[PDB]
């Protein structure tokens, strides 16, 4: 029965197309984002557990050199912060402050890369969730005025040339609302999860730079 | 067109204002999006390249060779270094004031660069926060005009005033259409500019320590 | 007109509960703004004395008579100094643990102080987020009840059901209007609490430095 | 012309909305003048700073002009007072004087910010409230229209529209007053924040220089 696209105006066809595309894009973003978020969290916690399990830093770095291309999560931060740290330590850098500050900078850069990679299309989800029921409202007002101009032409509505405007308005608001549903459903959840991951990475940096300072000042 | 060009000079004027606002917003969209993407790519490239085991003097002289074309992160490097060497010419500021002289040089240049990046961003904020209100001024004024006329004529059970409310609501429709992409921009581009500002402020804070170490060794 | 006896029982209950919510929100508004103004006035009025030049030990000696009457900054000073003195006297061998203990005492005292200060604020935000919804429930109930009532009459006369529909609109007339002052007061008072929090944070940043400089001289 | 025959409550609503519009425009003119003057003064003082002149001479120059002093100059002037008030009374630790001067400068910055922007939160409040006041006003007119309808029953097709217009003009005036306030609230708040950043930078630079050179003198 859904054949309103042909029995509708061009502008309202355009806004329905925009909104259905937005909804499908949001759903695809959800499916492609939740899996990667869960995998990243699992990998981060696993590597954090392995880091504290009485293993020397050198052995962990040697084993983590390994797959140097498809390396992500906290392990990437550790590798990036240790390789440059040892390079500086061997490349003179007699001042411990220089090497530990370099390690902190490396932790910084690695997190600011990995987290930004994780946080993709999430602001888009928030934007669509916030703005869909105003594109819907614009389409609905267009339908209402298209109905009113038709009404203002004869002595009776006749329920034949006014129904298209009613259908336009109703479909516009329904489609806008259906687009807005998943976005508002999941934007806050995913943002909170990303913030939790950010806190985890920050605490990992704190512990790692504390250990690095201790090691550098020991000798 | 015919409905738009039908009496109500106020409606025509306000709709024209909204159309001008819409076209200005849609131009500013691409104008500040292409430049933002270019600046982000430049910042990422310079972050990757600066600490890639290259002596500072070599990068400085490369920038001098590449001068009068600098944009982005390199500026907040170069505008610092020219000062740091200039102060560091003996019989001058001792090696603990030159660091903050150089930091001032970096920071003024960074603020100027950010202002150059954020040219029209604080216009989308005020084009999407009042376009609905302007359109609603149009629609309420139109409804007022269409209702005073009903106080004199008799009967006319909505068969004469309906085009009045239609011509009123078209203003609201155009207002919302002009306002939507405005707030889209004023969210997305503002967040991107905030990210770039934080990154630049962070690069300055690290380069200050780098210059500390350089002055200690020089 | 009162429009209460004519209104259904559920609608009248909605008006009553929403009136009560507005009363509670305004009372909390007055109490919280008064208390916050008093605290802000006392903040600098104690800070100047703390930094006028009088000895810290002498000021603490002046304290201890107002054990339970101490306000925010005064209580923070009292707790911090008492904890630092207790640690130093009991141990008398801590290299740098005294400043850590003082910082911990300061942090817990600050947290307790603000948790007491904004004791009722996170109710305003909880009435601003439901007042439109309870009003919309009221008007929806009115509309659907009126339409259900229009299911037996002939000719499908609509003007006869004019009052009830209008009553539903009045559900949101005493509806959303119970939310706006709540949300605005929530935002403004949260801003004030945040500025006070920043002030106390700077107070700690100064006090920990004071103990850091004083520990090696005692 | 229509502010004589509406209801008393609608009269009051229109009056307060007109007062809101007038206050908004006056505040806009006053603030966009004073902020421009303050920015010009700050730029001039920044140019005067780092001119090779010792801070003592600058403070001596500022001493003569005390009552009619504002902007970043005050952040210097008052601050220097603290730096000397703890120097002549040589009873403080060497790091204590700089901290006291920083506190005095921060208090000066807070006072300057409070004085610089005064009615901006009022602009925000009117921008957020005016549509709702208009809605209350027009709802009252609409309910009175129904009350008038209740008197006699002839479908009331023709004689209600003047009431609808006289009720909706309240919303018209409300959003007319709301337009400039919300248009310029951000426009002025961003400028005030820029001034705040400038003053914070100046305070940071002053604290930096005080720790190393000026402490000796």
């Amino acid at each position: 029965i859904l054949d309103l696209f042909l029995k509708a105006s061009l502008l309202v066809k355009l806004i329905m197309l925009i909104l259905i595309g937005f909804s499908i894009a949001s759903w695809a973003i959800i499916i492609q984002r939740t899996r990667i978020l869960n995998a990243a969290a699992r990998e981060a916690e696993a590597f954090e557990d392995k880091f504290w399990s009485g293993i020397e830093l050198s052995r962990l770095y040697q084993e983590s050199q390994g797959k140097r291309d498809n390396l992500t999560g906290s392990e990437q931060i550790f590798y990036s912060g240790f390789k440059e740290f040892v390079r500086l330590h061997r490349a003179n850098s007699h001042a411990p402050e220089a090497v530990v500050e370099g390690a902190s900078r490396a932790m910084r850069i690695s997190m600011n890369r990995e987290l930004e990679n994780l946080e993709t299309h999430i602001p888009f989800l928030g934007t669509v969730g916030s703005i869909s029921p105003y594109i819907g409202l614009f389409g609905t007002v267009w339908g209402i005025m298209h109905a009113f101009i038709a009404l203002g032409a004869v002595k009776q509505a006749t329920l034949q040339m006014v129904a298209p405007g009613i259908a336009e308005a109703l479909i516009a608001t329904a489609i806008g609302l259906f687009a807005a549903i998943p976005a508002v459903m999941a934007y806050n959840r995913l943002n909170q999860r990303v913030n939790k991951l950010e806190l985890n990475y920050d605490n990992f940096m704190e512990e790692f730079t504390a250990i690095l300072h201790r090691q550098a000042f020991t000798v | 067109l015919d409905l738009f060009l039908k009496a109500s000079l106020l409606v025509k004027l306000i709709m024209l204002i909204l159309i001008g606002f819409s076209i200005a917003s849609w131009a500013i969209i691409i104008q500040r999006t292409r430049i933002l993407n270019a600046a982000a790519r430049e910042a990422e490239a310079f972050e990757d390249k600066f600490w890639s085991g290259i002596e500072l003097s070599r990068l400085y002289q490369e920038s001098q060779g590449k001068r009068d074309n600098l944009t982005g992160s390199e500026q907040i490097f170069y505008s610092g270094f020219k000062e740091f060497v200039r102060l560091h010419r003996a019989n001058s500021h001792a090696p603990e004031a030159v660091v903050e002289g150089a930091s001032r040089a970096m920071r003024i240049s960074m603020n100027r660069e950010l202002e150059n990046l954020e040219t029209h961003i604080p216009f989308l904020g005020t084009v999407g926060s009042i376009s609905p209100y302007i359109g609603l001024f149009g629609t309420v004024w139109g409804i007022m005009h269409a209702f005073i006329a009903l106080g004199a004529v008799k009967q006319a059970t909505l068969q004469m005033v309906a085009p009045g409310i239609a011509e009123a609501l078209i203003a609201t429709a155009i207002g919302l259409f002009a306002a939507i992409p405005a707030v889209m921009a004023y969210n997305r581009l503002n967040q991107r500019v905030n990210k770039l500002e934080l990154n630049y402020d962070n690069f300055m804070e690290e380069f200050t320590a780098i210059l500390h170490r350089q002055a200690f060794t020089v | 007109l009162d429009l209460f006896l004519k209104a259904s029982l559920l609608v009248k209950l909605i008006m009553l509960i929403l009136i009560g919510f507005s009363i509670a929100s305004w009372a909390i508004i007055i109490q919280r703004t008064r208390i916050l103004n008093a605290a802000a006035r006392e903040a600098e009025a104690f800070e100047d004395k703390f930094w006028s030049g009088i000895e810290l030990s002498r000021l603490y000696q002046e304290s201890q008579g107002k054990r339970d009457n101490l306000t925010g900054s005064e209580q923070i000073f009292y707790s911090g100094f008492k904890e630092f003195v207790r640690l130093h006297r009991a141990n008398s061998h801590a290299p740098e643990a005294v400043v850590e203990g003082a910082s911990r005492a300061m942090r817990i005292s600050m947290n307790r102080e603000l948790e007491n200060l904004e004791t009722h604020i996170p109710f305003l935000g909880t009435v601003g987020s439901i007042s439109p919804y309870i009003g919309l429930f009221g008007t929806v109930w009115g509309i659907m009840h009126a339409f259900i009532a229009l299911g037996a009459v002939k000719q499908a006369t609509l003007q006869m059901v004019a009052p009830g529909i209008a009553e539903a609109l009045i559900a949101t007339a005493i509806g959303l209007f119970a939310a706006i002052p709540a949300v605005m007061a929530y935002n403004r008072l949260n801003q004030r609490v945040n500025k006070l929090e920043l002030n106390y944070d700077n107070f700690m940043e100064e006090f920990t430095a004071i103990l850091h400089r004083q520990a090696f001289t005692v | 012309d229509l502010f004589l025959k509406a209801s008393l409550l609608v009269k009051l609503i229109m009056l307060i909305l007109i007062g809101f519009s007038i206050a908004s425009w006056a505040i806009i003119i006053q603030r966009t003048r004073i902020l421009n003057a303050a920015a010009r003064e700050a730029e001039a003082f920044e140019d005067k700073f780092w001119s090779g002149i010792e801070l003592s001479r600058l403070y001596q120059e500022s001493q003569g002009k005390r009552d009619n002093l504002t902007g970043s100059e005050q952040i210097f002037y008052s601050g220097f007072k603290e730096f000397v008030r703890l120097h002549r009374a040589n009873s403080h630790a060497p790091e204590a004087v700089v901290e006291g001067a920083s506190r005095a400068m921060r208090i000066s910055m807070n006072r300057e910010l409070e004085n610089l922007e005064t009615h901006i939160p009022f602009l925000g409040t009117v921008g957020s409230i005016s549509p709702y006041i208009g809605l209350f006003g027009t709802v009252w007119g609409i309910m009175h229209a129904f009350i008038a309808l209740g008197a006699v029953k002839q479908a009331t097709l023709q004689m209600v529209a003047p009431g609808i217009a006289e009720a909706l003009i309240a919303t018209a005036i409300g959003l007319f007053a709301a337009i400039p306030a919300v248009m310029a609230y951000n426009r002025l708040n961003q400028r005030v924040n820029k001034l705040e950043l400038n003053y914070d930078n100046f305070m940071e630079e002053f604290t930096a220089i005080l720790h190393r050179q000026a402490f000796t003198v």
Partner: peptide, 21 residues
């Protein structure tokens, strides 16, 4: 920062009474 369209609400009210009258 966000599309504030609450005054449109008023217009909506004005549009019901034209029908039931």
């Amino acid at each position: 920062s966000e599309i504030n369209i609450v005054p449109l609400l008023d217009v909506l009210l004005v549009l019901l009474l034209i029908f039931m009258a």
